[PDB]
Enzyme design. Sequence first.
Site, PDB file in Angstrom:
ATOM      1  CB  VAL A 122     -14.922  -6.571 -11.939  1.00  0.00           C
ATOM      2  CG1 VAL A 122     -13.429  -6.407 -11.979  1.00  0.00           C
ATOM      3  CG2 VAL A 122     -15.311  -7.945 -12.479  1.00  0.00           C
ATOM      4  CD  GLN A 161      -6.256  -0.021   7.657  1.00  0.00           C
ATOM      5  OE1 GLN A 161      -7.469   0.098   7.446  1.00  0.00           O
ATOM      6  NE2 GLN A 161      -5.688  -1.167   8.004  1.00  0.00           N
ATOM      7  CG  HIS A 201     -11.409  -0.297  13.332  1.00  0.00           C
ATOM      8  ND1 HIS A 201     -10.438  -0.065  14.276  1.00  0.00           N
ATOM      9  CD2 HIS A 201     -11.081  -1.462  12.724  1.00  0.00           C
ATOM     10  CE1 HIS A 201      -9.563  -1.046  14.248  1.00  0.00           C
ATOM     11  NE2 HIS A 201      -9.928  -1.905  13.312  1.00  0.00           N
ATOM     12  CG  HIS A 218      -5.538   0.270  15.948  1.00  0.00           C
ATOM     13  ND1 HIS A 218      -6.074  -0.875  16.504  1.00  0.00           N
ATOM     14  CD2 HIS A 218      -5.235  -0.038  14.661  1.00  0.00           C
ATOM     15  CE1 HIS A 218      -6.050  -1.844  15.608  1.00  0.00           C
ATOM     16  NE2 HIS A 218      -5.581  -1.352  14.476  1.00  0.00           N
ATOM     17  CG  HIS A 261     -11.059  -3.440  16.549  1.00  0.00           C
ATOM     18  ND1 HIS A 261      -9.773  -3.290  17.020  1.00  0.00           N
ATOM     19  CD2 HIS A 261     -11.064  -4.593  15.835  1.00  0.00           C
ATOM     20  CE1 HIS A 261      -9.038  -4.313  16.635  1.00  0.00           C
ATOM     21  NE2 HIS A 261      -9.794  -5.111  15.902  1.00  0.00           N
ATOM     22  NE  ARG A 319      11.603   0.820   8.322  1.00  0.00           N
ATOM     23  CZ  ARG A 319      11.675  -0.381   7.743  1.00  0.00           C
ATOM     24  NH1 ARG A 319      10.566  -1.111   7.597  1.00  0.00           N
ATOM     25  NH2 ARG A 319      12.863  -0.886   7.361  1.00  0.00           N
ATOM     26  NE  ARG A 362       3.669  18.431  11.745  1.00  0.00           N
ATOM     27  CZ  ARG A 362       3.105  17.283  11.361  1.00  0.00           C
ATOM     28  NH1 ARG A 362       1.840  17.240  11.001  1.00  0.00           N
ATOM     29  NH2 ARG A 362       3.845  16.159  11.273  1.00  0.00           N
TER      30      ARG A 362
HETATM   31  N1  LIG Z   1      10.544   4.972   4.261  1.00  0.00           N
HETATM   32  C1  LIG Z   1      10.569   5.318   5.572  1.00  0.00           C
HETATM   33  N2  LIG Z   1       9.943   6.456   5.919  1.00  0.00           N
HETATM   34  C2  LIG Z   1       9.951   6.843   7.207  1.00  0.00           C
HETATM   35  C3  LIG Z   1      10.583   6.024   8.244  1.00  0.00           C
HETATM   36  N3  LIG Z   1      10.426   6.651   9.417  1.00  0.00           N
HETATM   37  C4  LIG Z   1       9.715   7.764   9.151  1.00  0.00           C
HETATM   38  N4  LIG Z   1       9.447   7.885   7.834  1.00  0.00           N
HETATM   39  C5  LIG Z   1       8.731   8.962   7.140  1.00  0.00           C
HETATM   40  C6  LIG Z   1       7.640   9.619   7.974  1.00  0.00           C
HETATM   41  C7  LIG Z   1       7.747  11.023   7.432  1.00  0.00           C
HETATM   42  O1  LIG Z   1       6.963  11.067   6.220  1.00  0.00           O
HETATM   43  C8  LIG Z   1       9.198  11.281   7.062  1.00  0.00           C
HETATM   44  C9  LIG Z   1      10.033  11.938   8.172  1.00  0.00           C
HETATM   45  O2  LIG Z   1      10.027  11.060   9.321  1.00  0.00           O
HETATM   46  P1  LIG Z   1      11.104  11.251  10.514  1.00  0.00           P
HETATM   47  O3  LIG Z   1      10.691  10.255  11.542  1.00  0.00           O
HETATM   48  O4  LIG Z   1      12.484  11.305   9.911  1.00  0.00           O
HETATM   49  O5  LIG Z   1      10.714  12.782  10.904  1.00  0.00           O
HETATM   50  P2  LIG Z   1      10.612  13.446  12.345  1.00  0.00           P
HETATM   51  O6  LIG Z   1      10.251  14.921  12.110  1.00  0.00           O
HETATM   52  O7  LIG Z   1       9.879  12.551  13.235  1.00  0.00           O
HETATM   53  O8  LIG Z   1      12.153  13.398  12.743  1.00  0.00           O
HETATM   54  P3  LIG Z   1      13.010  14.485  13.603  1.00  0.00           P
HETATM   55  O9  LIG Z   1      13.257  13.689  14.844  1.00  0.00           O
HETATM   56  O10 LIG Z   1      12.139  15.695  13.692  1.00  0.00           O
HETATM   57  O11 LIG Z   1      14.224  14.543  12.731  1.00  0.00           O
HETATM   58  O12 LIG Z   1       9.675   9.981   6.793  1.00  0.00           O
HETATM   59  C10 LIG Z   1      11.240   4.802   7.763  1.00  0.00           C
HETATM   60  O13 LIG Z   1      11.835   4.058   8.534  1.00  0.00           O
HETATM   61  N5  LIG Z   1      11.169   4.516   6.476  1.00  0.00           N
HETATM   62  N1  LIG Z   2      -7.398  -0.955 -14.274  1.00  0.00           N
HETATM   63  C1  LIG Z   2      -8.455  -0.415 -14.878  1.00  0.00           C
HETATM   64  N2  LIG Z   2      -9.506  -0.289 -14.091  1.00  0.00           N
HETATM   65  C2  LIG Z   2     -10.677   0.235 -14.533  1.00  0.00           C
HETATM   66  C3  LIG Z   2     -10.828   0.663 -15.927  1.00  0.00           C
HETATM   67  N3  LIG Z   2     -12.068   1.151 -16.076  1.00  0.00           N
HETATM   68  C4  LIG Z   2     -12.676   1.000 -14.872  1.00  0.00           C
HETATM   69  N4  LIG Z   2     -11.841   0.438 -13.955  1.00  0.00           N
HETATM   70  C5  LIG Z   2     -12.091   0.110 -12.528  1.00  0.00           C
HETATM   71  C6  LIG Z   2     -13.119   0.962 -11.827  1.00  0.00           C
HETATM   72  C7  LIG Z   2     -13.773  -0.037 -10.883  1.00  0.00           C
HETATM   73  O1  LIG Z   2     -13.093  -0.101  -9.617  1.00  0.00           O
HETATM   74  C8  LIG Z   2     -13.674  -1.383 -11.600  1.00  0.00           C
HETATM   75  C9  LIG Z   2     -14.909  -1.763 -12.399  1.00  0.00           C
HETATM   76  O2  LIG Z   2     -15.150  -0.708 -13.322  1.00  0.00           O
HETATM   77  P1  LIG Z   2     -16.111  -0.934 -14.575  1.00  0.00           P
HETATM   78  O3  LIG Z   2     -16.195   0.319 -15.416  1.00  0.00           O
HETATM   79  O4  LIG Z   2     -15.670  -2.217 -15.204  1.00  0.00           O
HETATM   80  O5  LIG Z   2     -17.482  -1.215 -13.771  1.00  0.00           O
HETATM   81  P2  LIG Z   2     -18.930  -0.584 -14.120  1.00  0.00           P
HETATM   82  O6  LIG Z   2     -19.885  -1.034 -13.057  1.00  0.00           O
HETATM   83  O7  LIG Z   2     -18.862   0.892 -14.301  1.00  0.00           O
HETATM   84  O8  LIG Z   2     -19.256  -1.371 -15.521  1.00  0.00           O
HETATM   85  P3  LIG Z   2     -20.659  -2.186 -15.882  1.00  0.00           P
HETATM   86  O9  LIG Z   2     -21.023  -1.331 -17.039  1.00  0.00           O
HETATM   87  O10 LIG Z   2     -21.589  -2.047 -14.704  1.00  0.00           O
HETATM   88  O11 LIG Z   2     -20.180  -3.568 -16.183  1.00  0.00           O
HETATM   89  O12 LIG Z   2     -12.579  -1.225 -12.485  1.00  0.00           O
HETATM   90  C10 LIG Z   2      -9.617   0.464 -16.773  1.00  0.00           C
HETATM   91  O13 LIG Z   2      -9.689   0.834 -17.959  1.00  0.00           O
HETATM   92  N5  LIG Z   2      -8.491  -0.067 -16.196  1.00  0.00           N
END
Ligand SMILES: Nc1nc2c(ncn2[C@H]2C[C@H](O)[C@@H](COP(=O)(O)OP(=O)(O)OP(=O)(O)O)O2)c(=O)[nH]1
Ligand SMILES: Nc1nc2c(ncn2[C@H]2C[C@H](O)[C@@H](COP(=O)(O)OP(=O)(O)OP(=O)(O)O)O2)c(=O)[nH]1
EC number: 3.1.5.-
Lengths: 479, 483, 481, 481
Positions: free
Chosen positions: A4, A36, A97, A102, A120, A253, A332
């Site tokens: 898991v 990614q 990749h 990309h 890729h 975006r 920057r």
């Molecule tokens: N949620 C959201 N975030 C965005 C979008 N476009 C860009 N961002 C994020 C990327 C950056 O973490 C932050 C600023 O992006 P901007 O494209 O506004 O900044 P940039 O310095 O390119 O713009 P500037 O032309 O210098 O004003 O926001 C969008 O459409 N939606």
């Molecule tokens: N959401 C959540 N995730 C947890 C918790 N404890 C561990 N995980 C995550 C970490 C791993 O990505 C995944 C499996 O962790 P486990 O501790 O169940 O696996 P582990 O191999 O250490 O246990 P095993 O003794 O081998 O069965 O779940 C928890 O309390 N809540």
Amino acid sequence: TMKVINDPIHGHIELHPLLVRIIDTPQFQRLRYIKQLGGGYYVFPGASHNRFEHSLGVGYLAGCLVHALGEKQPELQISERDVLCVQIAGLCRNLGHGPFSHMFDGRFIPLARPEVKWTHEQGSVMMFEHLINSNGIKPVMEQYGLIPEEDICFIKEQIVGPLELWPYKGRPENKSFLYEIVSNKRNGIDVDKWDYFARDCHHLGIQNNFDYKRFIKFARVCEVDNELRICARDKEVGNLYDMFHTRNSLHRRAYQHKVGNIIDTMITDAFLKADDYIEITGAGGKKYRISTAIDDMEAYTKLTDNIFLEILYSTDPKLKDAREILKQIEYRNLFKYVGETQPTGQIKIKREDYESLPKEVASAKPKVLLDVKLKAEDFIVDVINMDYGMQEKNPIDHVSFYCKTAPNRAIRITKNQVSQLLPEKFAEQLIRVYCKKVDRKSLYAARQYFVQWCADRNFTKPQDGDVIAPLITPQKKEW
Amino acid sequence: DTMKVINDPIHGHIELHPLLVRIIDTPQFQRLRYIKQLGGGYYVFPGASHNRFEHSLGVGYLAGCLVHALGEKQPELQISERDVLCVQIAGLCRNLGHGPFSHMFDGRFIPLARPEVKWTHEQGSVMMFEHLINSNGIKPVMEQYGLIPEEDICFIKEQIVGPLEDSLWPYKGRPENKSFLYEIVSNKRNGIDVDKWDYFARDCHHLGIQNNFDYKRFIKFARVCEVDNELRICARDKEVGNLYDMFHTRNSLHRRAYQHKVGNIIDTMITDAFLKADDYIEITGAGGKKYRISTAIDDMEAYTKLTDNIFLEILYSTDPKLKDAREILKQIEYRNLFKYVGETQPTGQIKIKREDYESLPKEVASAKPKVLLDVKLKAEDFIVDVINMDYGMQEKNPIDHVSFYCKTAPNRAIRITKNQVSQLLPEKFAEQLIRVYCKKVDRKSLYAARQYFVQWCADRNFTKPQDGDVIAPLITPQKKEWN
Amino acid sequence: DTMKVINDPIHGHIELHPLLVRIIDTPQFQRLRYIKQLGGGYYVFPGASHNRFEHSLGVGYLAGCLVHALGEKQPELQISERDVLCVQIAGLCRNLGHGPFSHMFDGRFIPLARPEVKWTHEQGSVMMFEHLINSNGIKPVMEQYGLIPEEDICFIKEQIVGPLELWPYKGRPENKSFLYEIVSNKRNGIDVDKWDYFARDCHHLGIQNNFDYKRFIKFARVCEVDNELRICARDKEVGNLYDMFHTRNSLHRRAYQHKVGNIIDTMITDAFLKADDYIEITGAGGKKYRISTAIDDMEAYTKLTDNIFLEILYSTDPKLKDAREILKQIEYRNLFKYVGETQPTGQIKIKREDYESLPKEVASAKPKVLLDVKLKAEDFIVDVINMDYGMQEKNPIDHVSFYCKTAPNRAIRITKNQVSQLLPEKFAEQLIRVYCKKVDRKSLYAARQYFVQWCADRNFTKPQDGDVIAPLITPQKKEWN
Amino acid sequence: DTMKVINDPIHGHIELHPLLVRIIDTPQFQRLRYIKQLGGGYYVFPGASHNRFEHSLGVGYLAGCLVHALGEKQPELQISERDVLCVQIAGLCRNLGHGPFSHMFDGRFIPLARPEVKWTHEQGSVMMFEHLINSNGIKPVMEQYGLIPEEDICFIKEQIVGPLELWPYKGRPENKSFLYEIVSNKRNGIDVDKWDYFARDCHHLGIQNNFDYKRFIKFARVCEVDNELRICARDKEVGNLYDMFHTRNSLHRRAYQHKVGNIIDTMITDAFLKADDYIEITGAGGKKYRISTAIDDMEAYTKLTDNIFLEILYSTDPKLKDAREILKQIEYRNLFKYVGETQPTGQIKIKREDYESLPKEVASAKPKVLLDVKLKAEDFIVDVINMDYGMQEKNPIDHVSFYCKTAPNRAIRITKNQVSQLLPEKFAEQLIRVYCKKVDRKSLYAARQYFVQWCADRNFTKPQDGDVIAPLITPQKKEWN
Ligand SMILES: Nc1nc2c(ncn2[C@H]2C[C@H](O)[C@@H](COP(=O)(O)OP(=O)(O)OP(=O)(O)O)O2)c(=O)[nH]1
Ligand SMILES: Nc1nc2c(ncn2[C@H]2C[C@H](O)[C@@H](COP(=O)(O)OP(=O)(O)OP(=O)(O)O)O2)c(=O)[nH]1
Ligand SMILES: Nc1nc2c(ncn2[C@H]2C[C@H](O)[C@@H](COP(=O)(O)OP(=O)(O)OP(=O)(O)O)O2)c(=O)[nH]1
Ligand SMILES: Nc1nc2c(ncn2[C@H]2C[C@H](O)[C@@H](COP(=O)(O)OP(=O)(O)OP(=O)(O)O)O2)c(=O)[nH]1
């Protein structure tokens, strides 16, 4: 036994022991070290995520869909062997990749090795073979009921398509629908997109409009021209159009962010300048370059985002030029965006012409007084093809549907049958101009050249054209 | 009195000024707890239990966030606390006029109950607001906090319903230098306002469908600039993509939820029940005088007590006068609904007007499918629902009515056309969907309805229903373009 | 008749077998759309507009998820599709008995309106379930899908209300004992009803849920325990189980026992008491019932929902003037005033029978402070709240069985000391809230003095603001200083 | 220069003042992009790809939110733009001193490589900050925006590390005491660093966060406490404060101290120790440093990130063969095997000096069972984890000041008993994990016997799976059963 893993997108994923074995290899764990979104992390600081966790998500979703289909239609004769082969392909379709994703296949290798053709997907198939052979996987496959000859072929075919009448050898026409899950060559609707939509949105901090769970619940297999294919319920057609709308939004975006792209471009240049000097040890101790590691999987196994830091931290004077570029990124001091435009009406820009474009911009003759003259080398022109994944084509025309009143009869749905508010076009180009000279007067000049060039070519008026180039915009009548 | 904090699942902790709390704590406002945001939508999306009350708090909050942000960035705008409170009040109060089941009431019921009258929830909001203020001694409290009721009540009303009427500047509550204030609560120019922003996020949170629009981003990128001697709100040029996306999101939500075929039919059934009960349900207004469901809108004291409660009053009634009305609601409970036949659209330019709606059932019943039929249906057995899907300005592109600024010259307002953005955008901004349903729910009746319907589509060169070849395989062949 | 898919914001897309659809599409089920999950909580948390209907779909869905997962992991348990459906039906229907404003109805109104009767929503659920079945011809439909109505109806009811009185159940045998642990777990309280409300209530309230039920399902197994097959958790998940109860108690503290939501519930109850002689609700045979007697007839109870609030509020009858005035006060937010909160230092807490005497006790306190105004018993509300881990003084984790990875079918026990010394040493407590019906400044001030003095007289805990609201009183008590 | 907007998935759109952007755009800050927040945790929770960089932005943002909120509510505090920027800078830069894999570096590696040194990431942050300011000409930019570097740099450093040493601070006087409570709260640990990591770690780990920092900010005030102006919480929020620490302990239990995450950290640390003689990092003047000495030179430390892990893994040098093999084993998932966990009983605490003698002790145990293999000290790993509420034995809430709505300027204290009897009675404990380097079936079986025997011999708690893993050993200890 089964493992898991807790994934923030999918919650608790169960992994079959065979999958665990594939995962716990240097060839797979490599993907922990490849972001990614590449240079996108330098714009969206949430986007720290790597190919590795995305790959898990793809394998998981591949399994969910094949499971769903088998549970709903036992007549498909889907076997546990089939399920595992589909999960493995889903897990492994990102194996190919390179550093910064990309950027590597999209920017670097095309410039480093223009003669070669590389994707890729090709890389994924090669790494998979390397992974299998290096880790004695085939015995483990037969232990769980797989037949390596047929099944490895099947897996490869899922990733890259026919290794070329039915063109596939891994499974027959009665199992055709299996090939639609991991990498859908017919219309692009596959589990890879569904994971990256949800994962990237979670990390980017932008919201995802696509409900893959819903889609899976409504998916059925039907006979389409003597193939068994996955069909969507008729009413989901709106949502599929929206899924490609979402894809294009995420490209606009995030994946093609103007600054993300400029950073990718600078890192690529740094790599090109480092390429003669970085050495990577492959099979038999033989040494490869960044650009030639793709020819040897043992070398490629060790080629990740690490090269970025190896260059940055280097002291070798041969790497001074490459290292300097990366240091500018840290401060920057990036190349400056000047603007964006698009071709008008019919026009398209060919890949072969990309190189000539900075010369063209520099050749423009704005009728305005300038302190400075700019050169072709001071301009970067980035051309981006935005589409619905099938160039000019509508992917929904290549989807089959069924209706609740006759679930075994596959139908087609045209765009007119859905909405007149949909795109009338499915492909376009965006052209971004940047300037390497960052001072006030240089930048002012770059704006004049840019807008003049746009006019000279009858491209679209940049959105801020009247502000940045108030003397130039009036000359062009259309604007 | 002092500031209150309220926890909202969409916006988190919302602070309210004591004057706003005073307005909220009235029968006229609290009434909105008893009106579902999505009406019959709840009977399709079970999470859509939310009411107009909490939406209204959200609109008030967002209205305040935007006006506050503008003031922080541009102190030269001279935005006063008085301006802020008036904007919040308008935000809070723009939904006051809603009736039972929200859009159902003004969109379906009143037009059928009282076709002579013209009524909108916006006009209702103005009347209710006035009723709220006068009934609860609010005017004195406004002057306590420095508001000037004569100007400010006018300003608030104008924010909800527009100019109360020609002229460059048609508003009386504020001058042209504060024009940007009128763009916050109810934007008549292009519909980008904080009402949309709240219901996108709220409806999505309840529906279980994801919201693609980032209103917080929008607020950070918003500036005020001079446009034709007005100060207006300008968006950053770069955000034009996101604005097209905002309207796309709106359209998705309409398609998936607000115009769901079943939610629509349930609204239609409830409306019918109300028409049947209209003579008998009695609502006491001013002076003890008695009103009907259809006439409570004429007296705000009566309207204050008109909510989704009428649904349950009818449902739980025992009086045989209400038997007919009650039976329709009971069929809703058993899920014996009018049956969906199909959906089509007019092709190309063609549009169906409001005036034609009544002739449509007769038309469908008149179509002559060349098929043997067990049973023959009549006009009365059909319901034809026409739905207008647009970008909020009929055939117009709202983005042509937006002002932008660019980073190199933040005080210079500009325009951006569609071509300047993308070729993947819609070439049209309005379309129509036609849904047909049948009140006869037996298998043979339904099969017949399908044949009339698809024949009608063909006869009129409407689009092929998606399931046309399945539901009417004998009809679809005759039309060549279809197959 | 086919399966339906429903979209829920908590669970996503839920599949409903046609038999479940038939149950759902009845007046008896759909009734739940008109009963708020949190009652008067919505008057404090505006997001909490949700109703018992949607919670019930979620419980039915989770019940199915758990029994499916158990069957998939251990086919040797012999879980049948019949079992799956019966468990889903019980899950869907365990909230059928709820009254107007949910826990308000059975927790405050019925106790005061009809002290002689003993009634719970669970008993109601069983009664409504029977009424639903019989009124809608469901038994034939059950057999159509392979159920045995006599046994399975018994099984479903037992799942909701426990044994209808060695093995005390008739619906299923000891080998399927674990099926009784899914919908309404009488052994330790760990069931799918809590899991839905945690996630649903958090979503709507706007507070965060720390419990992961899906994780719990993945780690759940059946094991033999004292000749019963029971649901066992993986040993290492024990911390997560303690956390589940911790979360439940937090949700009670912050939301379900919010001091103002509780006083609103109290005010609505007071209005219902004042309306109960005048509202009439038609049941079987045209016979008429009251709010407080509609629980005796399911046909009447079917029509008893949050609607009565509005029927009172919008009434014009002079007889309902008193009830209507209280609801009007709620609208103007002229509420009874919270005075403060305290807890007993002593064990054995406070009897339900004693509750009536408490306002009189507060009024009988003699604070050594100058008071303009003398208050009476009737001026005070004293609300006593029992907060526990579901089993009074007992630790529910002592009643959970675990398994380890090296031996998945062998059950073990885990003690608190094996887990952490950061855990609670007690598992039950009482909160006492005091309010005053006189809301003027001088009355409120007086109420605070009496209150704090009563705390002192009784050796309750020092109210948190005690030194601020009653500076003359708090110094008298040495413990407090 | 103008303000920049950054989109963060946790906080949304964050506004950055030009001065802050200048600090961010330096090699010393951008370095944080290459250090995972959770170190070895990523190898267990694949969502935990997040780095110190994005966390530090979040801390800077929340530091600004708190100080801005306080200033808006209480203008009499005289909070200046200068104060706000200094608080934001300290918030941004309090993680600058972190090393490869975060807590692994300062919590495991440095203690072993350099036992003589006393080193904290906090000290490192102060040194890096100095280096950042000096190397990038920031001081001129500070004065351009109205800051006074001598006082303000001192104030920033003091916010991170405390007095650089009666009012002990020199960056600000007593009247601005409350400013030192925002970034790194030495009094009780309630600060904006925790608030970002709870929300960020939960978002990425895929586990739920129960603490609402925005609520806390809204209810925060400054009141006089013993001649200092300090941050006070509203009284009714005390429940939420106890819960905040509960959440922290849950995050540590589930995630930060995960048994496998810890062993991976341990393996990586060994690899670093074996590579430490051979890895070189170029620092000031071309001079070369080791992983263990890069902390002495900020120019070298700048280039010391998670990258060393891959430099070792990808190496070809035969001197690094041992280090490289350990990392290769991680890739194959051939990890040291978890044997079990236990805790000291009652009084006992395990001393730092004794950590190294513990594996010897386990190997010295004589389990009365037939074994194929005999194990040695070197085959065992013993990891000791100190779990607490941030102040060892002490209750942090005893060190928090409250106000009540009836007198918002009057600071008060609230004791545990005034809150709930369901709270922890203890605030610190120790967990002991044992692992085995030999991973074969026979070895693992033997290791279980030694481990449980050792527990018994030392009167530690019975491992939860003790009866399954060592059925012959557990009988001997009567207490266990
Ligand atoms: N949620 C959201 N975030 C965005 C979008 N476009 C860009 N961002 C994020 C990327 C950056 O973490 C932050 C600023 O992006 P901007 O494209 O506004 O900044 P940039 O310095 O390119 O713009 P500037 O032309 O210098 O004003 O926001 C969008 O459409 N939606
Ligand atoms: N959401 C959540 N995730 C947890 C918790 N404890 C561990 N995980 C995550 C970490 C791993 O990505 C995944 C499996 O962790 P486990 O501790 O169940 O696996 P582990 O191999 O250490 O246990 P095993 O003794 O081998 O069965 O779940 C928890 O309390 N809540
Ligand atoms: N998110 C969250 N919200 C809460 C909590 N407790 C209460 N709320 C919500 C309910 C309300 O909508 C809002 C204000 O509740 P409060 O209990 O702080 O206000 P109340 O007027 O009862 O307190 P007062 O004694 O008048 O200051 O916050 C909590 O612990 N977390
Ligand atoms: N997430 C999501 N939910 C939807 C969408 N459309 C409808 N729903 C919700 C409403 C219901 O709770 C549930 C089922 O709605 P459908 O419209 O798919 O089923 P309906 O019975 O109307 O259609 P059918 O009988 O299959 O023709 O899903 C959508 O696009 N997305």
